[PDB]
RNA sequence: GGCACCACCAGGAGUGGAGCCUGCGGCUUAAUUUGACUCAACACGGGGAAACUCACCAGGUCCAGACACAAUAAGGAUUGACAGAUUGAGAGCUCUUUCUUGAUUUUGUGGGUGGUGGUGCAUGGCCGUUCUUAGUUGGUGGAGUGAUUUGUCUGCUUAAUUGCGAUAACGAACGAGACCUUAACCUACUAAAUAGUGCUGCUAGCAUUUGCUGGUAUAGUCACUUCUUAGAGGGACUAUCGAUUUCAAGUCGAUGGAAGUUUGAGGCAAUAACAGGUCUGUGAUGCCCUUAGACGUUCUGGGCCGCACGCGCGCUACACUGACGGAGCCAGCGAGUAUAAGCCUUGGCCGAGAGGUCUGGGAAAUCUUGUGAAACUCCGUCGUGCUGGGGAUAGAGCAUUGUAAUUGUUGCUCUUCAACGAGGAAUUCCUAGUAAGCGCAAGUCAUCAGCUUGCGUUGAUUACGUCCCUGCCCUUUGUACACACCG
């Protein structure tokens, strides 16, 4: 299955509720974003985040989400 | 003589795994955390970490003069080829070589248990130490044999950073009874790390909000 | 016996220490006007010992399975003998070793 | 360990052990005729 | 153990003037490399120097490390009759190094 | 309730039936050393033992019994010894024999020391197992006088206590996941005479059209990094679009992609526990036993292989989807020496073979080596026959290793050509470059691989589901158990 982890659901919905004006739906750009937003100590879970966050941000102009 | 480079670089490792237990057996009584071989042209510079570097550089520095010989005299080096210094360990708590020890040193001076374990606890944690986790195993005047585990702090178990950060040491300590066995864990804060990860894998910084400034309709500021 | 075609082998187990060397003697043989070829990354060799994980021979038949990775960088520089030598001491390092062969 | 006692006074003892010598230990780094000439003297 | 006068000699002017002495666990072998007599004699002799306080004895890896206590050095300064200089090497005072 | 090819469903290959290899029990023995007995003992102790290994058996030497004493002792305490006898022995082991050395040392006392001797049910460490299942814990708050409890859960979802969600809980930690190694991509960087190529010198063969195949090339003092190597990076995050869903976590389809099963595969791996296995790995160990006619150690020979039998891991096979005979001819993981005590060995020359000999290369991306491997493929012979399937058993002979091959180490040659004609009750492993074949290398190793650990060649059938069997986990429940049903 790809049921992502807590170490990656909590750090991304930090993102949306401390850099929302900056982020965007695009996946490539939200990668480079968190770059220089987040110390993150592995690439694997640096393209985990952006790849969650962008889902947050596709599914927050549908509609509010929980937990932002 | 002539040796390939898969054979000499397991020579390497090999004289220094042999040359560190000859300290560990040599120098158990004072600290001895590790060995670090130094090699160089025209000689042979070894660092030896202690806690005492008294010990071994005792009266007019007779035993580190008289320890260096024997060397000599086992590899067939020349008497210039090789030097050893003595340099001391900067932060001993952090070492669990010295504090499995240091905990020996006092079991065999019929020290209690639980006064002897929790001073390397509180040892670790106060030079800073993340965490700390300390098993002795053995027997103690009955005939069955128990063992302990005295946690503090945050440990971690599995993968590679317990390879980057943990250090571990363990001896045997000869008792009128048997063998003790003693485990000493010492986790060091990756922030204090300078060679390196500086932190943990899943440790997420986020920056702060930079925003909340006041934006004024159209101006042009010239230089 | 001035300038020559001399080789610098470097063999060490860890790569970090190996590619300063190693960049560190082109940063110096840059600012230096000396034709250089190199470095060459010598296909790596993976020394392998698998061991019984059992001091005994009871339970599962587990198996460790160690490993001793060897890097071998050759060289070749383009300058008089004495200057070679002396960039070898300028850019030394404790775990590479250097074996210089004309 | 097995008492109540003796653990007790086995943390502040072991406590105090350790107090001592960090301080001990933070001050100790804060201030920091031949012999072969005789077998050849047979002239 | 049985060692000629003489091949005991000069396993005792190996241990002083360079004061420590390794010898290899074989008993069998020809020739210590460093004192001209059997490796098994060598063996035998310094462990009644280790017998009686004069040498320490450490054992890693199959191998002897024998080195000369300053109680020792008088035990050759009078047995060996010679002159009351003293220093054998190890202790010639060449002093460490900062 | 839930999960799982160490469970099943659909299937594949089988094993169990035969011969032989090897391990275990048994029997035998002079000894056939020994540990382990469900999973988690039985090709396991890296245990493929001619000597050694070795612990067993039949015999023979040495102290390598340090040290304080006491005795003895220069008018010599003791050690070595030719020759003959003795002995398996050119062991002065011992016996006749007198020579040599000289306070090192001989006897008694204590004290040692050494033990593959005993105790793994006295221990450390290590390892296996519960279990790699998904479980474990504390702060504040709520409940309870308390031990405790909630948090840690009805439901959905996941490989997962992992997430959604419900919620007297809120917010977290270990474990999981992250992490590390490896395999698959990069005509985008960095270079490579120990990698490769095009051109170019020089050069060969075949048709002459200027073409097609080569050799040579460490001075052509060329050009390039795609193939090869490896360092810095980039690249996949379930991305976009359809369905279902509490419109949530997710799941299933397409498109793009090198990669869309955690991308494939592993390494590490929590809180406790077992009288699990090892003192036969340790100059790791407590205690017991032994310590000179040794249970130490060494030497010789035998044994660990011994054979009416039961059992387990395997290899050949029972044929034609095949055997031979020629011919075609493709990998990857790796290893390799010196005054040694002898490494990998091409190339040449002998030999039917096995093998022998002379040189040379390589301490290695250079040489062995493109390891020209085997299955495999083509063309033939065979023609359903215990046959040219199968190659036990045995006779005679030829080489290699080793001090030593007898109880054949192994290899080769001729001959002998056995059971077996697809295997009862039962039972194992497995879902994609997987299973199955098929070989090759590394470990043990002077010699011996039917064994393991890996690697690659050829390469599928059938699910992608369930709790029916079996095992484990969770919840509820009962308990007179808590040394916890071995109660
Ligand atoms: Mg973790
Ligand atoms: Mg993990
Ligand atoms: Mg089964
Ligand atoms: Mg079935
Ligand atoms: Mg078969
Ligand atoms: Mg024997
Ligand atoms: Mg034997
Ligand atoms: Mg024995
Ligand atoms: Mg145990
Ligand atoms: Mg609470
Ligand atoms: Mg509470
Ligand atoms: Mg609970
Ligand atoms: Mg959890
Ligand atoms: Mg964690
Ligand atoms: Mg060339
Ligand atoms: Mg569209
Ligand atoms: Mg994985
Ligand atoms: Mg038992
Ligand atoms: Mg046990
Ligand atoms: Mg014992
Ligand atoms: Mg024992
Ligand atoms: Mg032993
Ligand atoms: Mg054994
Ligand atoms: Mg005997
Ligand atoms: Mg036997
Ligand atoms: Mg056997
Ligand atoms: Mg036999
Ligand atoms: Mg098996
Ligand atoms: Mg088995
Ligand atoms: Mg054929
Ligand atoms: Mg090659
Ligand atoms: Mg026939
Ligand atoms: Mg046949
Ligand atoms: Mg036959
Ligand atoms: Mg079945
Ligand atoms: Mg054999
Ligand atoms: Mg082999
Ligand atoms: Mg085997
Ligand atoms: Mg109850």
């Known amino acids: ?68 | ?223 | ?102 | 360990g097995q008492s109540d006692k003796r653990e007790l006074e086995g943390e502040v003892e072991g406590t105090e052990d350790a107090e001592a010598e960090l301080e001990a230990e933070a001050e100790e780094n804060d201030e920091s005729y031949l012999a072969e000439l005789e077998l050849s003297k047979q002239e | ?98």
């Open chain 3, 1 to 102: 016996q001035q300038i020559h075609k001399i080789r610098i082998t470097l063999t060490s187990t860890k790569v970090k220490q190996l590619e300063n060397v190693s960049a560190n003697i082109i940063r110096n043989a840059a600012q230096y006007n000396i034709v250089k070829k190199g470095p060459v990354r010598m296909p790596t060799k993976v020394l392998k010992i698998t061991t019984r994980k059992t001091p005994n021979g009871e339970g599962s038949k587990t198996w460790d399975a160690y490993e001793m990775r060897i890097h071998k960088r050759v060289i070749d520089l383009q300058a008089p003998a004495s200057t070679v030598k002396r960039i070898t001491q300028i850019t030394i390092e404790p775990g590479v070793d250097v074996e210089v062969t004309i």
């Open chain 2, 1 to 223: 003589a002539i040796l390939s480079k898969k054979k000499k670089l397991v020579a390497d490792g090999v004289f220094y795994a042999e040359l560190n237990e000859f300290f560990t057996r040599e120098l158990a009584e004072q600290g001895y955390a590790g060995v670090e071989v130094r090699k160089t042209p025209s000689k042979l510079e070894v660092i030896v970490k202690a806690s005492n570097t008294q010990g071994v550089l005792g009266e007019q520095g007779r035993r580190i003069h008289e320890l260096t010989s024997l060397i000599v005299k086992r590899f067939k080096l020349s008497p210039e080829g090789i030097a050893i210094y003595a340099e001391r360990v900067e932060e001993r708590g952090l070492s669990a070589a010295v504090q499995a020890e240091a905990l020996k040193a006092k079991l065999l001076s019929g020290l209690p248990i639980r006064r002897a374990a929790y001073g390397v606890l509180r040892f670790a944690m106060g030079a800073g130490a993340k965490g700390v986790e300390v098993v002795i195993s053995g027997k103690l005047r009955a005939a069955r044999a128990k063992s302990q585990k005295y946690a503090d702090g945050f440990m971690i178990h599995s993968g590679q950073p317990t390879r980057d950060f943990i250090d571990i040491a363990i001896r045997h300590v000869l008792m009128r009874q048997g063998v003790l066995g003693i485990k000493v864990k010492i986790m060091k804060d990756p922030a204090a790390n300078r060679f390196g990860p500086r932190a943990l894998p899943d440790a997420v910084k986020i920056a702060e909000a930079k925003d909340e400034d006041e934006v004024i309709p159209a101006p042009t500021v010239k230089s």
């Open chain 5, 1 to 98: 153990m049985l060692i000629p006068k003489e091949d005991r000699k000069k396993i005792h002017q190996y241990l002083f003037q360079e004061g420590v002495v390794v010898a290899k666990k074989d008993f069998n072998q020809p020739k210590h490399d460093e004192i001209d007599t059997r490796n098994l004699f060598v063996i035998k002799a310094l462990q009644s120097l280790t017998s009686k306080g004069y040498v320490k004895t450490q054992f890693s890896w199959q191998y002897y490390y024998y080195t000369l206590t300053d109680e020792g050095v008088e035990f050759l300064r009078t047995e060996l009759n010679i002159p009351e200089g003293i220093l054998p090497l190890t202790r010639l005072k060449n002093a460490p190094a900062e």
């Open chain 1, 1 to 68: 299955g790809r049921v992502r982890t807590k170490t990656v659901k909590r750090a991304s919905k930090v993102l949306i509720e401390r850099f929302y004006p900056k982020l965007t739906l695009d996946f490539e750009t939200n990668k480079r974003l968190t770059s220089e937003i987040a110390v993150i100590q592995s690439k694997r879970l640096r393209n985990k985040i952006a790849g969650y966050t962008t889902h947050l941000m596709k599914r927050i102009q549908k509609g509010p989400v929980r937990g932002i």
